[PDB]
Design a protein around this ligand. Sequence first.
Ligand SMILES: CCc1c(-c2csc(N3CCNC[C@@H]3C(=O)NCC(C)(C)C)n2)[nH]c(C)c1C(C)=O
Ligand SMILES: [Mg+2]
Length: 102
Amino acid sequence: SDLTFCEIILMEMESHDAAWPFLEPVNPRLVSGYRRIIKNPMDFSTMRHRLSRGGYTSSEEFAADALLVFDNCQTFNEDDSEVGKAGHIMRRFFESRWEEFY
Ligand SMILES: CCc1c(-c2csc(N3CCNC[C@@H]3C(=O)NCC(C)(C)C)n2)[nH]c(C)c1C(C)=O
Ligand SMILES: [Mg+2]
């Protein structure tokens, strides 16, 4: 039941217009300094894969990964960059959906 809500939230994030920076892992070969600055990368497909194999024991673990996506986004990208702007939309979306489930 805890995992049901995560499937709904993850499905909605995956299909969101603003999800485009977060659908796949950042390729550090293409992004100078990413490996240096971001210690714990995370993205929606990594969450999908972990959800698929049953690798989340609780919804709190799922939310930790979601928040990590947006913490990494704000650590690496300017708030007015295209990726930063998309990350703020996605972060607010996640927080608001998470709250109306718990
Ligand atoms: C800015 C990199 C980044 C992305 C991301 C995922 S798809 C994407 N793009 C697609 C089309 N044009 C804009 C941009 C792009 O390819 N720019 C060229 C590079 C910089 C890849 C050489 N960007 N997602 C996250 C979370 C990122 C970071 C650094 O946090
Ligand atoms: Mg926080």
